[PDB]
Amino acid sequence: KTSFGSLKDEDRIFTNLYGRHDWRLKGAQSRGDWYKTKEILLKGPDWILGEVKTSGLRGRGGAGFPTGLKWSFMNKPSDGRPKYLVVNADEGEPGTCKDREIIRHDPHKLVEGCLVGGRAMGARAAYIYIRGEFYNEASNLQVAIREAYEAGLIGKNACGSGYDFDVFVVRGAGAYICGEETALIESIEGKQGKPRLKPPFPADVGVFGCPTTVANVETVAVSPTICRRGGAWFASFGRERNSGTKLFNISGHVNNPCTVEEEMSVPLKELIEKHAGGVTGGWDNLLAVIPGGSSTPLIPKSVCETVLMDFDALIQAQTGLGTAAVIVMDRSTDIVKAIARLIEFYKHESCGQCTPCREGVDWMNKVMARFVRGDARPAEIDSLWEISKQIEGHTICALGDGAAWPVQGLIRHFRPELEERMQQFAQQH
Amino acid sequence: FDNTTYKNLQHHDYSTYTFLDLNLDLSKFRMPQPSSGRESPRH
Amino acid sequence: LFVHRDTPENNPETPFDFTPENYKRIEAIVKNYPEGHKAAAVLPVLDLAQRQNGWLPISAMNKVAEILQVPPMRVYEVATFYTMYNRKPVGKYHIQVCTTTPCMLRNSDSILEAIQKKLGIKVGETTPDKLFTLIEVECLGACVNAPMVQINDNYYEDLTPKDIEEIIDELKAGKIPKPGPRSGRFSCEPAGGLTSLTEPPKGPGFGVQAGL
Amino acid sequence: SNLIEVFVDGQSVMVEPGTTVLQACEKVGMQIPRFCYHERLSVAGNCRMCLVEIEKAPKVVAACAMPVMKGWNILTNSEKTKKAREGVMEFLLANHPLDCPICDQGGECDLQDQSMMFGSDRSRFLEGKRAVEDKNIGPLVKTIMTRCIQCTRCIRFASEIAGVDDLGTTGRGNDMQVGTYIEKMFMSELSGNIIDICPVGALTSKPYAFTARPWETRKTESIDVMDAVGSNIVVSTRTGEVMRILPRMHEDINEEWISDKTR
C-alpha cells in the first residue's frame, strides 16, 4: 500500500473511545474484551512477545521504541526478585489527552493489557501510575479492576490459567516529570520524582530495585487485541516500521477539537480536515502545527501541506510524532508567545536535579520572555540556539531535550518574526 | 442499540474517599506481597 | 516558599491525627507494596492527610513520617516537590485554571479574568469568606476540551465566561455542579457529529486469528 | 582474567568490571572534572561536569556513573568533551553570585579553578540572578546558600556517613533548595566535614570566617589528640598563628574526615 488513512470502524481498537457504550465489564465483554484471554496466557510469553514483535508496535508514550524488543528484556530467568509491569498513565504532555479516554471509557482494555503484557514479561503484578488530577478516571479504573477481580479475570489463577497477577493503581501528586520512566519509578517508591541515570536499565534494576518494564497506557491497551487478531493484522496498517492504528488529539485552532483513532501514516492535512473539521478560518489560515505534543518542534504550513503522521515521516520534517497530539495554530496566533508559554511550562516542570535543565531551561525562559516583547538584539537569537544545544543531550533525562526542541523549532522556522519584533521594540524605544 | 447518550455518568457521584474506599475493598483480593527480608533499608 | 517557619496556626504542636476509619484506609495503602518498602506509601498517605484535613500543616507531615517510620525530612521533600499538596490552607473550592498553550490558544485568559471579576480576587488569593482559591496550573490533560478548569476533584470543560460564572454561582449556593463539557458534547468526540465509531462495535471473537 | 581492556585517548588500560569511565581515567593520571561526584559518597550524576565523549558514540556519557565497556575509547580532550564542559560551567555560573572577594572559598574553590581550567573566559548571561535565603543549622557551619550549586554532596554525606537524614532538597526546578525545611540544627559529631566536601562557599566554617586566605597559610601535617583514634590532620598557620584544622587523608585511620572536636 502507498496511501494511508480512512480507517474503518471494524479495525478500530478503542471502540468505546467516546464513552457512548457501557464502560464496565459487561459492556467490555460484549465488545470483545477478555475473550480467550486464557488461551493467550497459555500460549506462553515467547508466543506473546512474538506477536507484539511481528505487529511492529512502537511505544505510544512519546519515544516510540519498538515494543516487542523492549518487552523481551524481561524474558529471562528469575533470580529471586519479583518482576513488575509499570503502566504509565501520567499523561502529562501538553496537548495530549488520549490516555485519559482509554482509562475512563475503555478501562478493561487496559486491565487485560496489563495481564497479557505482564504474562509476557513474567511479572507478578502491574502498577498503574495515574496522574493525581485524573481522580474521576482513577476511580473508574478502580471499579473496573474490582469487576475483573470479582470475575476471576485477574488475581489468583487469572482467567483460570494458573497464573497469578495483581493490578494496583497508584496516583501521582502533580508533576509532569513523573511521566519519565525512571522518575515514575522513583515516585512509586515514595521519593521526589527525579529521573535515574542509566545504566542500570529498569529491566535490570527498576521499581523497588527489581526487574521492571514501564509501558504507556495505549501501548499496553492494544496488546490483547494484537494477540487475538494477530501481529500481521496490526502490521497491515501504516507504512513499514510505522505499523498500526494511532490515537490522535487535535486541539488549538481547529473547528472541532477532538480525539480520534486513525491509521498510522495518515497525512497531517487529511487528519485535521476529515476529523477536526479543518483549520479555524480555513486551511489557508494555518500558521504552524505542533504534531506530537509540546516536546516536538513545530512545523510551518508549507511543511504541513504534505507531511505524513508517523515516526519516520515527521523525523525527516525535523520533528517527531511524539504522543501524536496535534496542536494547531492559525495566523492570528502570536507564535513567539505560544512557544514562550511552553518554555514556561518546562521551567515549572523541571525536577531541578541536573544542572543543564535546572539552570538552562530557566535561562531560556527568561530569554524567550524578552523575545516576546522584542526587548533583545538579534545576536541573542544565535545565542539562544547555542544555549538550547548545550541543554540537549547533556541532561539526565529527556525533559531537557523536550525543552530545547520547541525553542529550536521556533528559531528554525520563524526567525524573521523574532527579528521583526526586536526591530519594532527598538524604534519604539 | 443506542449511540446518542453518554454512559459514563457514575463519576458524577464520586466523593473524597471514593478511590481509597475501593482500594480498601480490593485489599482482600490481592496475593501476599513479596518481602525484601528486612523491615526497611535502615534496618 | 519552600522553607517552613513555625506559627501559632502551623507548628509541630498543631493538632492532627488520622481518624479511625482513615487508619483502616492507610493499612490497605501500605499493603499494596512489598514488605520492607513502606516508604512507597508516603505519597498516598500524605494525600490522605490532605483529604481529611484540607491542607498539610507541619504536624501532619510529622505524623506521616512517624506512621511509616521514614525520616521527617524525606516527607518534607515530597510535600514540597509535588504541587497538589497544599502546605497552606486553601478555600473550600480550589479553582485551578489551565493556562498552557493548548488551553491558552482557546482563550483560557477570558476564563481567568471572568473568575477574577466575579470573585473579586487575584490569582493566588483566597476569598474573604474562604470559599474560593484561584491559581493557574499547567496542562491538566484535557486539551481537546479547552479552555477548562479543575475545582477540587472535578473537571469543567469547553468553558466560556458565562459557563464558569454559572459554575461559581452554583458553588456559592451549596449546589454541586455536574462536571464535564459545558458546550454540548459529552467528552472528546468532535462537535457537529461523530467522524468515527458510528457503527455498532463488533462482538466477541471478531477478527480472531486461527490457533487461539 | 577478570580485567577488561579499555582505552583512554588511545592508551590501553586494564580495569576490573564495574569500573566507571572516570575511574578508568584516574588509572592513566587524568582527573575528569567533577562537582557532585565524591569517591566516598554514593554516585549522583547530577552536576554533569564529568561528561566525556566515547569514540564512535554520538552522546556524551557521565563519566562518574557510566560503567566502562570493553573496547571503549574515552576521549578526555576532544572538542565534544571540551564543549560539554564549557556548556555545563556556563550554566553553573549563570546564577552564581559575584561573591569571590567576600567568600571564604576564594582561592581554594573548585568552582573557581575548574572554571579557570575548563570553562569559558567570559559571560553571555544577560538576565538577573537567583537569590536564596540563608538557613541557620548551628554555630559551626555558616550557610550562604545563594552560592550552592545543588551538588547534593552534603545531603549524601549526612545520610550515608553521619547517618542523619535532616538535609534534603525542597521545591523543584530552578527553585530547588538544600536545607532542613524546618528550623533545625545539624549538630552531629561529624557535621563539620560538610564544609570540606561542599565544593563552593555555600557551607563554610563559622569560627574560621574571614580570617585568612588559602594561599597565605602554611600547612603543617600533624596528628589529632582529641581522642585515641589518631586522626591525621593539617594545621593551617599564618604568621605564627594557628588558623584552622583540616583533615589529612589516611585510608586506614580517619579516611578524609575528622570529628567536630578535632576540627
Ligand SMILES: Cc1cc2nc3c(=O)[nH]c(=O)nc-3n(C[C@H](O)[C@H](O)[C@H](O)COP(=O)(O)O)c2cc1C
Ligand atoms: C518529561 C517526560 C514526560 C513523559 N511523560 C509520559 C507520559 O505522560 N506518558 C507516557 O506514556 N510516557 C511519558 N514519557 C515517556 C516515558 O519516559 C517512556 O518512554 C514511556 O513510558 C515508555 O512507554 P512506551 O514505550 O510504551 O511508550 C515521558 C518522558 C519524559 C522525558
Ligand code: SF4
Ligand atoms: S533534565 Fe530536567 S527534569 Fe530531567 S533530570 Fe535533569 S533537571 Fe530533572
Ligand code: SF4
Ligand atoms: S564559591 Fe567559589 S566561585 Fe562562588 S563566590 Fe565563592 S570563591 Fe567565587
Ligand code: SF4
Ligand atoms: S550546600 Fe554545598 S555540598 Fe550541599 S548541595 Fe549545595 S553546593 Fe553541594
Ligand code: FES
Ligand atoms: S493545555 Fe490545558 S488541559 Fe492541556
Ligand code: FES
Ligand atoms: S561528577 Fe559526574 S555528574 Fe557530577
Ligand SMILES: [K+]
Ligand atoms: K566549602
